[PDB]
């Protein structure tokens, strides 16, 4: 997995690849790793997939209860605290490594959150087995106060670095762009990889497979 985030002039850009692996086999070519937290907050996930799915869902659900009560747009810091207090409580046994980004009444915020419950608040972060490839791109090219399209280019370059250099990462690039005014969930943003063209027809005619037994059960 390669996941990443940037703070730009007017918001946040989050990015992710779409490969999920089981051992060193690709199980999913089009996994969605940028999870909904609230309408103004999203969270990329890496690490153990059931854990990132269930953790983001639980915090999103608790936040929706919170905002229903407060009648206000939720804060990024709130998602951060809920996530990190839960992860800490489980002592790293919940293997969720997260990039949390959004925009609240105090502006754009971005955090990386680790399985043992530490967080770092930073203007660019990466996580996952591709994170050093993605971070190299950011250290080399990030500038403060990028425009939207520069920020998007930078994130997708970082994710591409992970895609091409990390055997744990692959397939498509998803982005999510979050400003005061707008939410653009861009899935796929890019499709840099495609299966090669299937050079043979194998047209298996009816009867090719021998059958011992058959039961037709009709339905209404």
């Amino acid at each position: 997995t390669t996941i990443a985030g940037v703070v730009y002039k007017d918001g946040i850009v989050l990015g992710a690849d779409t490969r999920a692996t089981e051992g060193m086999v690709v199980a999913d070519k089009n996994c969605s790793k940028i999870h909904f937290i609230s309408p103004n907050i999203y969270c990329c996930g890496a690490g153990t997939a059931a854990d990132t799915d269930m953790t983001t869902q639980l915090i999103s659900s608790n936040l929706e209860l919170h905002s229903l009560s407060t009648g206000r747009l939720p804060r990024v810091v709130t998602a951060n605290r809920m996530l990190k207090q839960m992860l800490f409580r489980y002592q790293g046994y919940i293997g969720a490594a997260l990039v949390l980004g959004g925009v609240d009444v105090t502006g754009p915020h971005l955090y990386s959150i680790y399985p043992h419950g530490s967080t770092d608040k930073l203007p660019y972060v990466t996580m996952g087995s591709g994170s050093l490839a993605a971070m190299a791109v950011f250290e080399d090219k990030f500038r403060p106060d990028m425009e939207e399209e520069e920020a998007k280019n930078l994130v997708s370059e970082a994710i591409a670095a992970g895609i091409f250099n990390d055997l744990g990462s692959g397939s498509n690039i998803d982005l999510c762009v979050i400003s005061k005014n707008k939410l653009d969930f861009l899935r796929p943003y890019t499709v840099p990889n495609k299966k090669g063209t299937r050079l043979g027809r194998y047209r298996c005619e009816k009867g090719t497979t021998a059958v011992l037994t058959e039961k037709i059960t009709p339905l209404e």
Binding site: K84, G92, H116, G117, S118, T119, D120, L122
Partner: protein
């Protein structure tokens, strides 16, 4: 990490490097290891990021509630005691080497070390974290009774610079804070502003 704090007449100076590592990857090159626990009380954090963040947030909570109840600024010694109780009770499950420093109206500038294991001791100045090993000799030779704020800032910046050069787990920028009755003044020494000492190349 390298953390440090020094007492002066009227307050304290605190300092840290800014490196977070996982193995030898730098996961944050500009970490803020000096965390406000109340208006005039900070902790400097070393060891586990997760542990020291959880413990600092918990103490912040405890101290804030205690302070509202009493309707007075908390004592530095109280903040230290609360860190100590939590670090000692959970000493088997935590990796936390802490320095508590700050100012209160009763005892003025104070520095407490709460090293791993959860003992607590007041000191004139304190150093901790993995990089502190490399500056014991320097601090012991250079410390003087009666240093001014400005001298404590320079002393601190120099010590941390020295540790940062040698300790692979320390580095980045130097974050400093001075705390006194008047408030908290924070600054960052980066790049050329970090004190510099030549590599001793051959004649």
């Amino acid at each position: 990490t390298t953390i440090m704090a020094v007492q002066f007449d009227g307050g304290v100076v605190l300092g840290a490097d800014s490196r977070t590592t996982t193995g030898s990857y730098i996961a944050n090159r500009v970490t803020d290891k000096l965390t406000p626990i109340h208006d005039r009380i900070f902790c400097c954090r070393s060891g586990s990021a997760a542990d020291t963040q959880a413990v600092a947030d918990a103490v912040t909570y405890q101290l804030g509630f205690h302070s509202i109840e009493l309707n007075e600024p908390p004592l530095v010694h109280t903040a230290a005691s609360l860190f100590k109780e939590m670090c000692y009770r959970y000493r088997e499950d935590l990796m936390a080497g802490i320095i508590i420093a700050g100012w209160d109206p009763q005892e003025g500038g104070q520095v407490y070390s709460v090293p791993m294991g959860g003992m607590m001791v007041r000191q004139s100045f304190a150093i901790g974290g993995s990089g502190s090993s490399y500056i014991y000799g320097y601090v012991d030779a250079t410390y003087r009774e009666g240093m001014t704020k400005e001298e404590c800032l320079q002393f601190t910046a120099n010590a941390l610079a020295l540790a940062m050069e040698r300790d692979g787990s320390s580095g980045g920028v130097i974050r400093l804070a001075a705390i006194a009755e008047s408030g908290v003044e924070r600054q960052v020494l980066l790049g050329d502003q970090i004190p510099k000492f030549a590599v001793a190349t051959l004649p």
